[PDB]
Amino acid sequence: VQEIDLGLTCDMHVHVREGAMCELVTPKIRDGGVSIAYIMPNLQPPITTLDRVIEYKKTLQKLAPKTTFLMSFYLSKDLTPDLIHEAAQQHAIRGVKCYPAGVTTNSAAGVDPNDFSAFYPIFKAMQEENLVLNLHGEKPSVHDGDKEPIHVLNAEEAFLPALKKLHNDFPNLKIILEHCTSESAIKTIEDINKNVKKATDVKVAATLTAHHLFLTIDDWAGNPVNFCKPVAKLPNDKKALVKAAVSGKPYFFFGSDSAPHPVQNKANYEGVCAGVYSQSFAIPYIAQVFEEQNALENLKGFVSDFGISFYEVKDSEVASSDKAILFKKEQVIPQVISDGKDISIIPFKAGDKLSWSVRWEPRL
């Protein structure tokens, strides 16, 4: 069609930073077609305390009163089981996000995924509170010269056993392999979900971004704006990801990993910041894929039903009941997204035109 009622859309992987960047980006969650956002915690310093996560949400709600914000802790050395219980009962967090140390933006305070044991008391506490464990599933790189090298291309596959071990050791814990990028990872998620049918059985899920449904290594090799973690991989991988996205299966749903960086932090000869900014046109990006796959009927599941179901989002939490209406009027993605002061963002697929727009409708 033209005009599709997507209802209460979900983006379960959002970065909105702080300060002026946050003031620019947080209103764009709504503008991009997203009602519900799961907010990642890799701030400087990481979000590891109750007061910080409460005030952060306050800041976000003031900037965007109609957006529903689900918050998270950064899996940290500082964290204790005791704070996990406290934060959960105050409904101050919906999950804890794990960054392996050094693999991505603001991950230097993260963990070694070879030895998760020191966080098992944290994971047991999360398991009891029905909290979500989000994993940036990549092992840190190892060249070494004795055991198998780990690099940006196999670091996701090399993480898959750690995922299984965590799932085995905490079988009631809801776990997400965030932003999956490889056929290997799809197969592992498919397998873990062998005989779960109809949604409520899913304990381990994976989010898929907009940009990994378009990008391959060829697109970021010479183009830092398309460089993100985990890196876009081979055509065979993008094929597995697109097939999963339009599949209608409840263990794949949308998480943009929209990651804003000022343009000066992309135009570096070294230390290019990882991340693709997709917030401003999130749902229109995804619609393009589903149109091309002749599967617009599975769109509402991928960007709404499955994320709501897995995170158990209740209508009583929702900051606005407005529905996201996808309507097929052309727009051109600007070359830059700016606050008119010092922040310029290069948006994903800058300069390209999209077939779809999104507007907001009240429920009556």
C-alpha to C-alpha distance for 290 and 302, rounded to whole angstroms: 10
Asked if 338 touches a second copy (CB under 8 A), the answer is no
Write out the two tokens for 202: 């899913």
Asked if 11 touches Zn ion (CB under 5 A), the answer is no
Pairing label, strands 337-338, 344-345: antiparallel
Residues 6+ apart with CB under 8 A from 240: 182, 183, 186, 187
Q: Residue 200 or 268: which CB sits closer to a second copy? A: 268
Q: Residue 263 or 319: which CB sits closer to a second copy? A: 263
- Contact string (CB under 8 A) for a second copy, positions 201-230, x = contact: ---------------xxx--xxxxxxx---
Using an 8 Å Cβ cutoff, are 205 and 253 in contact? yes
Total number of residues shown for the chain: 364
**62 is annotated as contributing to ligand binding:** no
> From Zn ion, a second copy, none, which one binds at residue 358 (CB under 5 to 8 Å depending on kind)?
none
- Contact string (CB under 8 A) for a second copy, positions 343-362, x = contact: ---x----------------
Asked if 97 touches Zn ion (CB under 5 A), the answer is no
C-alpha to C-alpha distance for 285 and 218, rounded to whole angstroms: 19
> From a second copy, Zn ion, none, which one binds at residue 216 (CB under 5 to 8 Å depending on kind)?
a second copy
**211 is annotated as contributing to ligand binding:** no
User: What phi and psi values does residue 54 have, to the nearest 5 degrees?
Assistant: -70, -50
> From a second copy, Zn ion, none, which one binds at residue 325 (CB under 5 to 8 Å depending on kind)?
none
First to last CA, the chain: 23
3-state SS assignment for residue 228? coil
C-alpha to C-alpha distance for 246 and 295, rounded to whole angstroms: 6
Considering only residues 116 through 155, tell me which ones interact with Zn ion, judged by CB under 5 A. 136
CB atoms near residue 5 (< 10 Å) = 11
**179 is annotated as contributing to ligand binding:** yes
Q: How many residues bind a second copy (CB under 8 A)?
A: 31
- Contact string (CB under 8 A) for a second copy, positions 244-283, x = contact: -------------------x--xxxxxxxxx---------
What is the helix, strand, coil percentage profile of the chain, to 5?
Answer: 35, 15, 45
- Contact string (CB under 5 A) for Zn ion, positions 225-264, x = contact: --------------------------------x-------
SS3 string, 154-199, reads CCCHHHHHHHHHHHHHCCCCEEEECCCCCHHHHHHHHHHCCCCCCC
**167 is annotated as contributing to ligand binding:** no
3-state SS assignment for residue 101? coil
Strand partners, 323: 361
Using an 8 Å Cβ cutoff, are 129 and 84 in contact? yes
- Contact string (CB under 8 A) for a second copy, positions 33-72, x = contact: ----------------------------------------
Q: Please, what is the minimum distance in Å from the beta carbon of residue 347 to a second copy?
A: 11
Stretch that binds a second copy, among 233-241, 252-260, 301-309, 321-329 (CB under 8 A): 233-241
The site for a second copy (CB under 8 A) is made up of 141, 143, 149, 151-153, 216-218, 221-227, 231, 234-236, 263, 266-274, 346
Q: Which residues make up each annotated binding site for Zn(2+)?
A: 13, 15, 97, 136, 179, 257
The site for Zn ion (CB under 5 A) is made up of 136, 257
